[PDB]
């Protein structure tokens, strides 16, 4: 808790749905947003901060709260958009040999700044005396180890708590979320959303020789004509779906009522039957 990691993770597809099946977590409270909508929001970089506290101290990890650990080792402001993921680890972090390894900085002068790490080891000076380093009646060790033992009960067990702080500065976002894809239908009147640019039409096999760096493809107008699939490296021509005009030929509503229909721009195969020019 006095020296916690600050892992800056970015440039990936953060699949938070996988985190629900990695380890049997006991706390997945996210204050900012919902986990379902979290996979559809872009972010610049996530700050992972992990530490180990007791069971009765997990309640102190909140966006604004006092306590022996909330204002002395790690404090969160009232804007935390991440989660407070935590889980018990009383399977490998508790052996009967003396657990004089951790600490929680029982002594302090004032509340630390939110999201600050104070890696210090100087002797706590309780005023009214210049302590150049001594341990008696005026200046003591500001650090104190825990008493984690396997033959204990829940509440005073090693609980690993990891928070994921989110931020959005004036920089392009890297971590957005894992995309989704469906089957690639053949030539048919369908809708397509290939990597951004959307549209409706028919996807046929194209013979164009695209460059190894060009993805899209246009014409004399500002409309996409051919596109390459961003997950199989295959070019496909986009021809707009079959539309046209409909004319009615009528000999006159005075001798008969039979009429003929003329579909313009149709190949009598994408609507007796007569194919004219």
């Amino acid at each position: 808790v006095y020296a916690w990691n600050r892992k800056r993770i970015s440039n990936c597809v953060a699949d938070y749905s996988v985190l629900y099946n990695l380890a049997p977590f006991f706390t997945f409270k996210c204050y900012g947003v919902s986990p379902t909508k979290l996979n559809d929001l872009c972010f610049t970089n996530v700050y992972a901060d992990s530490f180990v506290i007791r069971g009765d101290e997990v309640r102190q990890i909140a966006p604004g709260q006092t306590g022996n650990i909330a204002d002395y080792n790690y404090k969160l402001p009232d804007d935390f958009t991440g989660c407070v993921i935590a889980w018990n680890s009383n399977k490998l972090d508790s052996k009967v040999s003396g657990n004089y390894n951790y600490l929680y900085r029982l002594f302090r002068k004032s509340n630390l700044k939110p999201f600050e790490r104070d890696i210090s080891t100087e002797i706590y000076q309780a005023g009214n005396k210049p302590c150049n380093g001594v341990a008696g009646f005026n200046c003591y060790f500001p650090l104190r180890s825990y008493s984690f033992r396997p033959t204990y009960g829940v509440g005073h067990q090693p609980y690993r708590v990891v928070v994921l702080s989110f931020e959005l500065l004036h920089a392009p976002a890297t971590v957005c979320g894992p995309k989704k894809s469906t089957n690639l239908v053949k030539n048919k009147c369908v809708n397509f959303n290939f990597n951004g640019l959307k549209g409706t039409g028919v996807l046929t096999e194209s013979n164009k020789k695209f460059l190894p760096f060009q993805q899209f493809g246009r014409d004399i107008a500002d409309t996409t004509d051919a596109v390459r699939d961003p997950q199989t490296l295959e070019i496909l021509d986009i021809t707009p779906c079959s539309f046209g005009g409909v004319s009615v030929i009528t000999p006159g509503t005075n001798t008969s009522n039979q009429v003929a229909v003329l579909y313009q721009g149709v190949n009598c195969t994408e609507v007796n039957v007569f194919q004219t020019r």
Partner: single-chain antibody
Framework: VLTQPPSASGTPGQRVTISCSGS????????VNWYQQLPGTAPKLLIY???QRPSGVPDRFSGSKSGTSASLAISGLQSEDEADYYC??????????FGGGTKLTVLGEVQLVESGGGVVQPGGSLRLSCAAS????????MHWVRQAPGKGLEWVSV????????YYADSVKGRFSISRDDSKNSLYLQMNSLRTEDTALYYC????????????????????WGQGTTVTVSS
């Protein structure tokens, strides 16, 4: 508030799908819990945390939390699966909202016994006792889940294993006092301002977590229930 089919149906051999709809304030920020109760006997835990199942519950049940709603699935139901299914979730407003019940009818070891009921004078009431036998009461939390005869279930109050902060329902707040003692496994719930609308069983339900179900939003569940007394005030 949770929306659940009041009384569904089904045929043997195939599978059904019981659903539970809830807003993002309770289900979207927590985990749903599915409880099974046979007609006549005490309820029992069926599915907790939407992913795991207890040791007694076989692989014949499955649950999913796709989106803001929960979905149940019973592959290959039989006559033994004819019971009431209840959905439960802890809302972010310090409350535990239960479901309504699903009549999935198809026509082809620690004891947690409690007592302290009996008909009393309206307005006032008596204390509600509870007991157990060697189950590490300090490392477990307790709930009060009453059930009116024929009606559904609802959450009354919760006490954590630490014995500090406690929470009550929206109707039993203030006039109820839940506490424990340093003696053997017990639980004392004193009721006040009786409005005669309390004809239920007051199940002294055992949990598995330690703190109140507000900080541990992924492990909170409910262990084996206990045979409760039938308290009928009836004014």
């Amino acid at each position: 508030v949770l929306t659940q089919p009041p009384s569904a149906s089904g045929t043997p051999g195939q599978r059904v799908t019981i659903s539970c709809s809830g807003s993002s304030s309770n289900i979207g920020s927590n985990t749903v819990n599915w409880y099974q109760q046979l007609p006549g006997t005490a309820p029992k835990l069926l599915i907790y945390s939407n992913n795991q199942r207890p040791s007694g519950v076989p692989d014949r049940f499955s649950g999913s939390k796709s989106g803001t709603s929960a979905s149940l699935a019973i592959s290959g139901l039989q006559s033994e699966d004819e019971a009431d299914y209840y959905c439960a979730a802890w809302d972010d407003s310090l409350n535990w909202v239960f479901g309504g019940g699903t009549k999935l009818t198809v026509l082809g070891e620690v004891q947690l016994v409690e007592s302290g009921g009996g008909v009393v004078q309206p307005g006032g009431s008596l204390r509600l006792s509870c007991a157990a036998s060697g189950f590490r009461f300090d490392d477990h939390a307790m709930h009060w889940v009453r059930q009116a005869p024929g009606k559904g279930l609802e959450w009354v109050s919760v006490i954590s294993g630490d014995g500090g902060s406690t929470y009550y329902a929206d109707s039993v707040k203030g006039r109820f006092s839940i506490s424990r003692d340093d003696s053997k496994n017990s639980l004392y719930l004193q009721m006040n301002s009786l409005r005669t609308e309390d004809t239920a069983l007051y199940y002294c339900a055992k949990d598995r977590s330690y703190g109140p179900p507000d900080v541990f939003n992924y492990e909170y569940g409910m262990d084996v229930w206990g045979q409760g007394t039938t308290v009928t005030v009836s004014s």
